[PDB]
Structure formats: structure tokens, C-alpha cells
Amino acid sequence: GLGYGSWEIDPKDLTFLKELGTGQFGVVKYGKWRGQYDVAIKMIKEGSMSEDEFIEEAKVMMNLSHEKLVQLYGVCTKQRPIFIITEYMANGCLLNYLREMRHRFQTQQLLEMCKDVCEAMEYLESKQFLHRDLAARNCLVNDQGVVKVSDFGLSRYVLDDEYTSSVGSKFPVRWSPPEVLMYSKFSSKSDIWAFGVLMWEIYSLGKMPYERFTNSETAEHIAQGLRLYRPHLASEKVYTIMYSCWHEKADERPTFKILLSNILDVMDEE
Ligand SMILES: Cc1ccncc1-c1cccc2c(N)c(C(N)=O)nnc12
To answer: How far is CA 190 from the centre of its chain?
Structure first.
């Protein structure tokens, strides 16, 4: 349409249906686009996001597509209550899904969730794109039980300093390697560390990492070289994979390509 770039979606094409949940940019709703196509509508909360910066980045994000990566559809910009329009994921956030004991997951299903995420992450890594806040809260589950990685890179646009200061009350300390906590050194290997913690979350059925510790205590534990330990549902081989993400030296941590190989190996063996 006349006043629209390819990254831009006319909000008048949206039908709102129900609330899906919430998080750091506020509410996310389920809708239809042009009456027919399922979408999630992230209704970005006023003053929560560096919106011009994000909008520019969205243009780059439009070109990221992978089956295990939540698809960005476009953005509604002509309105500073902006909308981000994404792939609809009917089963919601992975963290809540893991915590519902009714599912009675087999460990084979849990390993597949790890592989889903790993595939998305290998893709992002092949594009030199850091997630920057990988965790179960940032993974979604579709109506087929497939896990996909969401909100990739969005922490760069969070205006709330509680989220972005490493000592900030809202920083993801529990998903952070020592070099992030100590000197804010983000890299592919910080994404690797978080993926390991994500595997732990999955095999722990959504327990909080370091659940008995405060953030400050967690940071001290980690800096001393101590680690999460083996969830009851992880085999020795699965435990080995997650633990490899937590090498004190960042350059000794695997890539997502190697981790994917390792996960496929275990799948063939177990
Ligand atoms: C993952 C996330 C990050 C930031 N703020 C909200 C969410 C979120 C919470 C619950 C449910 C959903 C959901 N169903 C969809 C979706 N695309 O369907 N997206 N985000 C959700």
C-alpha cells in the first residue's frame, strides 16, 4: 500500500482475538491478518523500547527465516504505540509449557526441544546474529509442539536500565557467563552459555536456575567456577552437552554447529 515499505504492515489489516501473554514490552495478542492468517501482535508498551533503532533493525530481521525461528512478519510504525507482528505460537512460552506437569514428557521430547532451539541458534550463528537473551522465556511452542526461538536481539532496544545493567535488578544473571557478569563481554560464546542454561531449564521442567540463590549469590558462585548440576531427567550424555556450554574459557565452548551434531548423536544413541 501507498504509505508502506516491505517491512510495514497496515494495522487496519488486523483483527484482535485474545491475549496471549506479556513480558518486557507489555502485552502480546492473537489476531488475524486480512481475516485469514494467524498472527501474534506484540503491542509495544509506550516508553519501553528504542523504537527508531528497532525499526531499522527490523529491516534486517525480515530477512532472517528458519523453520525453528519465530518469523517476523512486519511492523506497524505509523503510530507510536507500535506493533510487532510475528508467527503465531498457539502453545505459548516454553517456560510455562515445561511447568505444566500434565504433559508428562518423555526425555526424547525434551531432547527434541533442545534440537529445535539448537537449529534456530546455528542458523542465527551462521548469520553472525546474537540472540543476546536466550532462555526458556524467549522460546515458544506451536500447536504441533515444535519449539521456536523468539525475540532474538530485542534486548538491544530495552529502555529500562534494570534489564540492561549487569547489576540491574532485571538483568538475566542466571543465563550469563562470567565474562558478561564481570566485564560485559557479549559474544557467540555468551549465546552458547545461555543455551546450556536453557537445556538445563528444559531437563529441569522449567525450574529456575540456581533456585536457592539470589542473583548476587549466583554471580559469585559462577565467578568461582561452580555450575548448575545434572537435572534428574538428563542422561550422562545430555548432561555432558549442557556442561560443555559452561567452560570458564569462552573459546573452549562449542559452536551451535558442534552442539547440534552432539545432540543428534545422543538422539541416535538414546
Ligand atoms: C515470548 C515472549 C517474549 C516477550 N513478551 C511476550 C512473550 C510471549 C508470552 C506468552 C506467549 C507468547 C506468544 N504466544 C507469542 C506468539 N508469537 O504466539 N509470542 N510471545 C509470547
So the answer is: 13
